[PDB]
Design an enzyme around this catalytic site. Sequence first.
Site, PDB file in Angstrom:
ATOM      1  N   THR A  33       0.821  -1.194   0.000  1.00  0.00           N
ATOM      2  CA  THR A  33       0.000   0.000   0.000  1.00  0.00           C
ATOM      3  C   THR A  33       0.868   1.263   0.000  1.00  0.00           C
ATOM      4  OG1 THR A  33      -1.834  -1.163   1.066  1.00  0.00           O
ATOM      5  CG2 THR A  33      -1.801   1.214   1.263  1.00  0.00           C
ATOM      6  N   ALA A  34       1.802   1.402   0.933  1.00  0.00           N
ATOM      7  CA  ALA A  34       2.563   2.647   1.056  1.00  0.00           C
ATOM      8  C   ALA A  34       3.608   2.771  -0.050  1.00  0.00           C
ATOM      9  CB  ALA A  34       3.235   2.779   2.405  1.00  0.00           C
TER      10      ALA A  34
ATOM     11  N   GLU B  73       9.751  -5.358  -4.643  1.00  0.00           N
ATOM     12  CA  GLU B  73       8.648  -6.134  -3.996  1.00  0.00           C
ATOM     13  C   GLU B  73       8.963  -7.622  -4.022  1.00  0.00           C
ATOM     14  OE1 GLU B  73       6.003  -5.738  -2.199  1.00  0.00           O
ATOM     15  OE2 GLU B  73       5.709  -7.933  -2.314  1.00  0.00           O
TER      16      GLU B  73
ATOM     17  N   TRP C 110       2.939 -13.849   3.327  1.00  0.00           N
ATOM     18  CA  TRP C 110       4.231 -14.334   3.843  1.00  0.00           C
ATOM     19  C   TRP C 110       4.031 -15.692   4.514  1.00  0.00           C
ATOM     20  CZ3 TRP C 110       9.062 -12.357   3.071  1.00  0.00           C
ATOM     21  CH2 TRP C 110       9.071 -11.186   2.265  1.00  0.00           C
TER      22      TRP C 110
ATOM     23  N   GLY D  12      -0.995  -5.235   1.070  1.00  0.00           N
ATOM     24  CA  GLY D  12      -2.146  -5.462   1.942  1.00  0.00           C
ATOM     25  C   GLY D  12      -3.469  -5.136   1.270  1.00  0.00           C
TER      26      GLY D  12
ATOM     27  N   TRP E 175      -5.681  -7.509  11.450  1.00  0.00           N
ATOM     28  CA  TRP E 175      -4.609  -7.224  10.501  1.00  0.00           C
ATOM     29  C   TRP E 175      -4.265  -5.726  10.390  1.00  0.00           C
ATOM     30  CZ3 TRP E 175      -8.937 -10.138   8.558  1.00  0.00           C
ATOM     31  CH2 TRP E 175      -8.807 -11.537   8.647  1.00  0.00           C
ATOM     32  N   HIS E 176      -4.443  -5.005  11.497  1.00  0.00           N
ATOM     33  CA  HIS E 176      -4.214  -3.576  11.562  1.00  0.00           C
ATOM     34  C   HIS E 176      -2.949  -3.259  12.337  1.00  0.00           C
ATOM     35  CE1 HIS E 176      -8.773  -3.071  10.750  1.00  0.00           C
ATOM     36  NE2 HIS E 176      -8.098  -3.403   9.669  1.00  0.00           N
TER      37      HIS E 176
ATOM     38  N   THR F 283      -6.810   0.142   8.575  1.00  0.00           N
ATOM     39  CA  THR F 283      -5.540   0.855   8.370  1.00  0.00           C
ATOM     40  C   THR F 283      -5.039   1.088   6.948  1.00  0.00           C
ATOM     41  OG1 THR F 283      -4.456  -1.254   9.005  1.00  0.00           O
ATOM     42  CG2 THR F 283      -4.557   0.548  10.636  1.00  0.00           C
ATOM     43  N   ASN F 284      -5.755   0.585   5.949  1.00  0.00           N
ATOM     44  CA  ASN F 284      -5.340   0.819   4.583  1.00  0.00           C
ATOM     45  C   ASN F 284      -5.447   2.250   4.062  1.00  0.00           C
ATOM     46  OD1 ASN F 284      -4.178  -0.921   2.346  1.00  0.00           O
ATOM     47  ND2 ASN F 284      -5.679   0.406   1.298  1.00  0.00           N
TER      48      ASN F 284
HETATM   49  C1  LIG Z   1      -6.025 -10.258   4.865  1.00  0.00           C
HETATM   50  C2  LIG Z   1      -5.987  -8.769   5.135  1.00  0.00           C
HETATM   51  C3  LIG Z   1      -7.155  -8.011   4.964  1.00  0.00           C
HETATM   52  C4  LIG Z   1      -7.173  -6.634   5.212  1.00  0.00           C
HETATM   53  N1  LIG Z   1      -8.293  -5.880   5.024  1.00  0.00           N
HETATM   54  C5  LIG Z   1      -8.251  -4.543   5.102  1.00  0.00           C
HETATM   55  C6  LIG Z   1      -9.365  -3.783   4.712  1.00  0.00           C
HETATM   56  O1  LIG Z   1     -10.387  -4.357   4.270  1.00  0.00           O
HETATM   57  N2  LIG Z   1      -9.363  -2.425   4.865  1.00  0.00           N
HETATM   58  C7  LIG Z   1      -8.280  -1.811   5.369  1.00  0.00           C
HETATM   59  O2  LIG Z   1      -8.306  -0.550   5.497  1.00  0.00           O
HETATM   60  N3  LIG Z   1      -7.163  -2.517   5.751  1.00  0.00           N
HETATM   61  C8  LIG Z   1      -7.169  -3.883   5.719  1.00  0.00           C
HETATM   62  N4  LIG Z   1      -5.995  -4.593   5.959  1.00  0.00           N
HETATM   63  C9  LIG Z   1      -4.806  -3.858   6.407  1.00  0.00           C
HETATM   64  C10 LIG Z   1      -4.077  -3.068   5.337  1.00  0.00           C
HETATM   65  O3  LIG Z   1      -4.047  -3.895   4.170  1.00  0.00           O
HETATM   66  C11 LIG Z   1      -2.685  -2.788   5.865  1.00  0.00           C
HETATM   67  O4  LIG Z   1      -2.671  -2.112   7.154  1.00  0.00           O
HETATM   68  C12 LIG Z   1      -1.891  -2.014   4.815  1.00  0.00           C
HETATM   69  O5  LIG Z   1      -1.656  -2.819   3.641  1.00  0.00           O
HETATM   70  C13 LIG Z   1      -0.506  -1.684   5.364  1.00  0.00           C
HETATM   71  O6  LIG Z   1       0.235  -1.115   4.285  1.00  0.00           O
HETATM   72  P1  LIG Z   1       1.828  -1.193   4.369  1.00  0.00           P
HETATM   73  O7  LIG Z   1       2.299  -0.506   3.117  1.00  0.00           O
HETATM   74  O8  LIG Z   1       2.282  -0.743   5.715  1.00  0.00           O
HETATM   75  O9  LIG Z   1       2.223  -2.752   4.277  1.00  0.00           O
HETATM   76  P2  LIG Z   1       1.867  -3.797   3.124  1.00  0.00           P
HETATM   77  O10 LIG Z   1       0.677  -3.328   2.258  1.00  0.00           O
HETATM   78  O11 LIG Z   1       1.643  -5.082   3.876  1.00  0.00           O
HETATM   79  O12 LIG Z   1       3.141  -3.813   2.217  1.00  0.00           O
HETATM   80  C14 LIG Z   1       4.403  -4.324   2.593  1.00  0.00           C
HETATM   81  C15 LIG Z   1       5.022  -4.942   1.354  1.00  0.00           C
HETATM   82  O13 LIG Z   1       6.397  -5.133   1.595  1.00  0.00           O
HETATM   83  C16 LIG Z   1       6.780  -6.353   1.025  1.00  0.00           C
HETATM   84  N5  LIG Z   1       8.028  -6.736   1.663  1.00  0.00           N
HETATM   85  C17 LIG Z   1       8.199  -7.015   2.963  1.00  0.00           C
HETATM   86  N6  LIG Z   1       9.529  -7.280   3.226  1.00  0.00           N
HETATM   87  C18 LIG Z   1      10.244  -7.145   2.058  1.00  0.00           C
HETATM   88  C19 LIG Z   1      11.563  -7.290   1.644  1.00  0.00           C
HETATM   89  N7  LIG Z   1      12.586  -7.631   2.510  1.00  0.00           N
HETATM   90  N8  LIG Z   1      11.851  -6.980   0.318  1.00  0.00           N
HETATM   91  C20 LIG Z   1      10.914  -6.650  -0.585  1.00  0.00           C
HETATM   92  N9  LIG Z   1       9.612  -6.543  -0.233  1.00  0.00           N
HETATM   93  C21 LIG Z   1       9.226  -6.752   1.037  1.00  0.00           C
HETATM   94  C22 LIG Z   1       5.611  -7.274   1.231  1.00  0.00           C
HETATM   95  O14 LIG Z   1       5.633  -8.345   0.322  1.00  0.00           O
HETATM   96  C23 LIG Z   1       4.464  -6.306   0.991  1.00  0.00           C
HETATM   97  O15 LIG Z   1       4.093  -6.321  -0.383  1.00  0.00           O
HETATM   98  C24 LIG Z   1      -5.935  -5.984   5.665  1.00  0.00           C
HETATM   99  C25 LIG Z   1      -4.797  -6.768   5.794  1.00  0.00           C
HETATM  100  C26 LIG Z   1      -4.817  -8.129   5.525  1.00  0.00           C
HETATM  101  C27 LIG Z   1      -3.505  -8.833   5.727  1.00  0.00           C
END
Ligand SMILES: Cc1cc2nc3c(=O)[nH]c(=O)nc-3n(C[C@H](O)[C@H](O)[C@H](O)COP(=O)(O)OP(=O)(O)OC[C@H]3O[C@@H](n4cnc5c(N)ncnc54)[C@H](O)[C@@H]3O)c2cc1C
Lengths: 487, 520
Positions: A11-12, A32, A41, A71, A424-425, A470-471
Amino acid sequence: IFDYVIVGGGTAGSVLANRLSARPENRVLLIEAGIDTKFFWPNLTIHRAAEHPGITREPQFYEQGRLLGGGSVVSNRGLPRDYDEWQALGADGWDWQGVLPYFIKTERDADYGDDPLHGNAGPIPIGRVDSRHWSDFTVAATQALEAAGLPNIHDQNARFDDGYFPPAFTLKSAARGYLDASVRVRPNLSLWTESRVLKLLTTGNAITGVSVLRGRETLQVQAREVILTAGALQSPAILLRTGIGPAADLHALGIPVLADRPGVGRNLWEHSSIGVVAPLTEQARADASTHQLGIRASSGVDPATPSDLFLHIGADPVSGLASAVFWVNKPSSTGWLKLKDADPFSYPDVDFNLLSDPRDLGRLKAGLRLITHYFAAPSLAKYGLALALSRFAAPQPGGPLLNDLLQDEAALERYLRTNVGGTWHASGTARIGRADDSQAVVDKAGRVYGVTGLRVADASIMPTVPTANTNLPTLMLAEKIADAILT
Amino acid sequence: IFDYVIVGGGTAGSVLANRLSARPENRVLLIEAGIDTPENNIPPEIHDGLRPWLPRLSGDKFFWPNLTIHRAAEHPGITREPQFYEQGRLLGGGSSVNMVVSNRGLPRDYDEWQALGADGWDWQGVLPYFIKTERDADYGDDPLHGNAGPIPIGRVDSRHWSDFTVAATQALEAAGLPNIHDQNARFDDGYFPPAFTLKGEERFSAARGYLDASVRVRPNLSLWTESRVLKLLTTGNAITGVSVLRGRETLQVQAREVILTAGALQSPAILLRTGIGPAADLHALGIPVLADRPGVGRNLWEHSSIGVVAPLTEQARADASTGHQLGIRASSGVDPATPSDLFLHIGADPVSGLASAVFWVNKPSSTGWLKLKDADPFSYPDVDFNLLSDPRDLGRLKAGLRLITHYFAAPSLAKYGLALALSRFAAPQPGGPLLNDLLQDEAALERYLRTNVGGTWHASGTARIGRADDSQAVVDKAGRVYGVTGLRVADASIMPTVPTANTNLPTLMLAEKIADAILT
Ligand SMILES: Cc1cc2nc3c(=O)[nH]c(=O)nc-3n(C[C@H](O)[C@H](O)[C@H](O)COP(=O)(O)OP(=O)(O)OC[C@H]3O[C@@H](n4cnc5c(N)ncnc54)[C@H](O)[C@@H]3O)c2cc1C
Ligand SMILES: Cc1cc2nc3c(=O)[nH]c(=O)nc-3n(C[C@H](O)[C@H](O)[C@H](O)COP(=O)(O)OP(=O)(O)OC[C@H]3O[C@@H](n4cnc5c(N)ncnc54)[C@H](O)[C@@H]3O)c2cc1C
């Protein structure tokens, strides 16, 4: 030499890849570990509820996205008070007034895009089910909520009192909004999928790029700035393996300490969840056949924290179950993570420490009381549903009757400490704070204190979890950090 | 022998007279100390609903003459004086002399009333009675409203807003506040056209709502105007009638039940003089103690208020022309337990040549008391509102002044170039320090606020509902006074806390609910 290497394309990371490569002169690489757009994971386990006498806890699988767009469908902002509290906690400029323009920038609201608190030009389309398409089941629920005095607030994203509403969702991920075909064709944006960053490379206290596992080989990629958007569980592990974290813990693992930062991996927030289910009687099955209904409510446990419960009431003809699932949306408990060892392929040792503050146990009981209250109202009582407890994630039969557990509060407490879940937050593990706060990890523009060449720009940076899924807040925050970087 | 004698024909009294006399078998007498206001002869200073401030320019005429109170808590280095406190003295009482605004508060107020031991008085429980009281002209069809009650409620159309109001709204939008439209069915922070009670241009008191010609014809309803209750008649622990002054003659009226609806400062004084009160206070005045109830006259709430004014510049006066316009519910951030603890009005009056931003603390922490000076039925109580006794209320007032600063710095308002100064709330006028200078001097600001803090005429809580085992409680959930029989209180005295609201609509609601509890 890239200008920006972004670690993780979730997402970020997607937001940042988009925003930073919008300037032709920025040479950007997004790395990624997953596939381009099983999907998580593998074998990632966590401890859930706080250690407690009488209760035996085991490790549990915790889903984290492993694919481009990560996410990322429910899409909501939280409440003004969440962001005002982030500012009170030392996130200067991250108050409601400060974040609101970034919430606007991210979205295209199908229903309310002309209203002043909304956007109509952003890359993430947001919409709700028309409350006229509501099933007669959903309607009956709304009549019970009405009788308790709850309004239909219509739009949870621009109206912030207790009530019920059609939930806002993104339906046509952050990959297709932010890495659409127009963006991927940009000359100055590289995008490595199925590629996993192993370590950050450093020159003294400067981070100077990354070591990447790509196909079968290990590459070095040199970078002027590295941005971690690996998620709230993996971003701080990367920091810890780099020597950024509590000195004593790192020295115990033989990791050379670049900067003694005791906040790294602390302040782990989550939303604490539980379910209630019932088999659909025939009236209920039939009525359900004609994301429907969210409810923002107050538990009364702590006057300081109104709107601390989120509940969803639903009926599903397929599994044959009615359900009321909910969570503590403004909790008091926090946890931590730490390294198991220095191995880049190890997941961290994660303890969410849920229900460690007894106010959260209080909140779950209150939520359960509220559910009995609503389902006792005539329009829901007519269905004769027999409500039993269940795990939030696995809503299934097997749990004890709701009405009977509430009459045995010690048994109630045991059941909740045993079966409490997450939503998952995960957030807060590399939090924003002031330059002289020793538990802060990043500054207000995501720069990690104690080193150069390194930002964090994912859900790790949230000073608290908001009153929200948290998305959308993560998309907002990535928008805000990108804008600060672009200066 | 009357079934019910209702003491005080004000906001609550009017409701109770109408509801209890709807049953032919109930013999009801309503007793009001002030003048009648029959629909064919409403006094012109009362009848004028666009200038609801006019009763206050008639002086004493429509109020309890020379009723004085102490306002701010005693505090070292500030002397305080008794101040006149307007209370209605005529049929319809406070709703015949008020600023006509009609709002409910927030669900959290009434949920807290239940937590404090007022069972059934939660939001779910009071909401049906709010709906029953009103006919909302804008939203009467919607779920949280009524379209058939006796008190009409409406708002100005946002289209009709002055350019000045419009500019103020732009300033608040820049702060991230929505137009909430309907302050009575939507409970988050933001701005709105205030809801108010008027029939066209005319005032519409509880007397016009509940005591119209069709109700006054009831042969089972009696109405005594210019008649003042002096004492409660007692036989053991049962209240059995009243003595009433009518002209120079005093009369006794026998009653099965007496309902006190004499207002939040006078209902508890009546209780104290009857011997229902804290025993040591009563002993000291030689009043025989009928029941030792230490809550009688305690728990006095109010909304603590202050003003900010500026001469209208040319553009401001011009913008003010073009069209109760703008209310603002806001949070002080002083205590996360009390969101929406401030209320603010921003407007421009071309007559006085003053723009203003008046506000009060709508969820306070401070409470005061009243006690008797002596046993004389003609004396007023000794009243101490004790405002800013709790430091958090001082913080709320400083916070609202900062909010006012921020709003007025926005371009939509900054263009006017207004020189904001402090003022007492009740009488907005020059003479106060400049806002921006006094916010540079905290100790000066403190002393100013402690000196000049006002009320909003929302006196309440002095005979509070509470639990059958609570020493500080005075009435039960149906308004029955603990320790005696034959006596209820059914006015603003009984609120466990002042709500986040002007108190007229909540009083109408509580009287509807109490009447209903009585009729069951
Ligand atoms: C099953 C599920 C359902 C959800 N439903 C919702 C929802 O309906 N609404 C909502 O608002 N939120 C929901 N969430 C939460 C929301 O998706 C997350 O809080 C949000 O994605 C966090 O964004 P992020 O960028 O911090 O991390 P992420 O989106 O998790 O991104 C991290 C990325 O980093 C990658 N990565 C990690 N380590 C490495 C590495 N060493 N090298 C390269 N790549 C790496 C991972 O593969 C991943 O793609 C859900 C989460 C899950 C797991
Ligand atoms: C100037 C002013 C402006 C206000 N503005 C508003 C506003 O805009 N909006 C709002 O919601 N609220 C406002 N209020 C508050 C609201 O009007 C009152 O809280 C409400 O009227 C209380 O109703 P009550 O029935 O408790 O007492 P009251 O309405 O005061 O009724 C008490 C009645 O009992 C009578 N009485 C007292 N003692 C005796 C006795 N011994 N014998 C016989 N009769 C007696 C009095 O004459 C009076 O009529 C205002 C109040 C005032 C004074």
